[PDB]
Amino acid sequence: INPIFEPFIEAHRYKVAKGGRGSGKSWAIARLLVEAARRQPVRILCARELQNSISDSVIRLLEDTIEREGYSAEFEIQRSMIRHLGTNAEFMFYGIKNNPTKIKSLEGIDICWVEEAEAVTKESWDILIPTIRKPFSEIWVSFNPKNILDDTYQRFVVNPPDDICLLTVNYTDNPHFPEVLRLEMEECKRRNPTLYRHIWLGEPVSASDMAIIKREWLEAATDAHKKLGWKAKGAVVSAHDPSDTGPDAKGYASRHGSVVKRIAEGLLMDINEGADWATSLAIEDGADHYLWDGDGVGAGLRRQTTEAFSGKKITATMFKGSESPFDEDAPYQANVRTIGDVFRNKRAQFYYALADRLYLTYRAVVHGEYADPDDMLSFDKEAIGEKMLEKLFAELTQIQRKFNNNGKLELMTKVEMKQKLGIPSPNLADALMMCMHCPALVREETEIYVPS
Numbered sequence: 001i002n003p004i005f006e007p008f009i010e011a012h013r014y015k016v017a018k019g020g021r022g023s024g025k026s027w028a029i030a031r032l033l034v035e036a037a038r039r040q041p042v043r044i045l046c047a048r049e050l051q052n053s054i055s056d057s058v059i060r061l062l063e064d065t066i067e068r069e070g071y072s073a074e075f076e077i078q079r080s081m082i083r084h085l086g087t088n089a090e091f092m093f094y095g096i097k098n099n100p101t102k103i104k105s106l107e108g109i110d111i112c113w114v115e116e117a118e119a120v121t122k123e124s125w126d127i128l129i130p131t132i133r134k135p136f137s138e139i140w141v142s143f144n145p146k147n148i149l150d151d152t153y154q155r156f157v158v159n160p161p162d163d164i165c166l167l168t169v170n171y172t173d174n175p176h177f178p179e180v181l182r183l184e185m186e187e188c189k190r191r192n193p194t195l196y197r198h199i200w201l202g203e204p205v206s207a208s209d210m211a212i213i214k215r216e217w218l219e220a221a222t223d224a225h226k227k228l229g230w231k232a233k234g235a236v237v238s239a240h241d242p243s244d245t246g247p248d249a250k251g252y253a254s255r256h257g258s259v260v261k262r263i264a265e266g267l268l269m270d271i272n273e274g275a276d277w278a279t280s281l282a283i284e285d286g287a288d289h290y291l292w293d294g295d296g297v298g299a300g301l302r303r304q305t306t307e308a309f310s311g312k313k314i315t316a317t318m319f320k321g322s323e324s325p326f327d328e329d330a331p332y333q334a335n336v337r338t339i340g341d342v343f344r345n346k347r348a349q350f351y352y353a354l355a356d357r358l359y360l361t362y363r364a365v366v367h368g369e370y371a372d373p374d375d376m377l378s379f380d381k382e383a384i385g386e387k388m389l390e391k392l393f394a395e396l397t398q399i400q401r402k403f404n405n406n407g408k409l410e411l412m413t414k415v416e417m418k419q420k421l422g423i424p425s426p427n428l429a430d431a432l433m434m435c436m437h438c439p440a441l442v443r444e445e446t447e448i449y450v451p452s
């Protein structure tokens, strides 16, 4: 029984163990709760976010603990209950999302153990915590941190309650760390060091101090046009990131003026299938302007792209993020500082156009500061879909500035991100970034004109 957990023996309203995989927190807590039940007539609620069947709960772990220590003859074991025959202590097992009503009605709970608590949503906490209201009752929590902004992390680490005993552990704190897990761990440490730190050292995902777009801006910008009462006006712009020859999904983004309407991923496609997919989406979206990344495997797509739009007045622009910024000799607008003095290249230029729109939108939504909707950006959540919106947000928050020896704004490249961060190429984020750019001049009545 790892001495690190000794503080959980003392009385505290909150006992929270956070750590990486194989750290021993589950075995330690099960052991302590079993020893408590042997000695006090405690009612113990074992809760989790989702319990689709009893096998998803800790009941088996508790049974194994009982048998391991040789306490079997002291207990009654049923499908969904464990009871001590001497104290009448009782364990019960419920999923919060499954049985919210049952949970609210439970009486006399002395200890609540929330396991796998990283999955527990704010709404679940808000249901569960008020029910554990007996004087001297305790809430025990074990979790492997996910994102620093997830409720469980915010609730117990960043903005903690009174009387919390917080322990942080990892596999190095587990004197019984088994070989099978050690092998997985060392394998991971070598293959993906960043992932290893998250999984095995229990470090939550959080924003780099070099990140350019904050999660909270993206949350505010979600349906900002509904929140603030404006609607989409402008051209429809679509963009395609053809990715590479690797596994990473291709990307597509489309907006109608300041309202983003579609974020799509292209899986198991070659370069031509991907271009066909993306140009078809652009047509379906009624695009006036289409861009695609020409810096890599996309450099040869011009003919297929313009062919796909034949007969339709849709501009087609090859975006090369490595090029000097668009309009680089023009004055920069937030002796004269030019756009070219500020941005190293187009990739930086348009990622900052995106970030600037998002920040303005954030200040409008959250701080009530006025801004022209044309300068904002809103995500139409119903149109895009929660699933793809979340995928996009997870990529956008990883886009990082890097040091630049001429004091220009420059971002880590997709290749660098994969190498350093151990993540797939952020192709949805790049597709969205590219649709920030509108270099082709057009009118219903006129030619397409591409100044340069």
Ligand SMILES: Nc1ncnc2c1ncn2[C@@H]1O[C@H](COP(=O)(O)OP(=O)(O)OP(O)(O)=S)[C@@H](O)[C@H]1O
Pocket (backbone or CB within 6 Å): 001, 002, 019, 020, 021, 022, 023, 024, 025, 026, 027, 028, 144, 174, 176, 177, 178
């Ligand atoms: N007190 C102990 N005695 C014997 N073996 C232990 C003990 N504590 C941990 N272990 C072993 O270490 C392994 C991991 O412990 P766990 O408690 O399951 O860690 P964990 O932090 O809950 O892992 P995650 O986040 O579930 S993968 C167990 O499967 C046991 O094999």
Ligand SMILES: [Mg+2]
Pocket (backbone or CB within 6 Å): 025, 026, 027
């Ligand atoms: Mg565990």
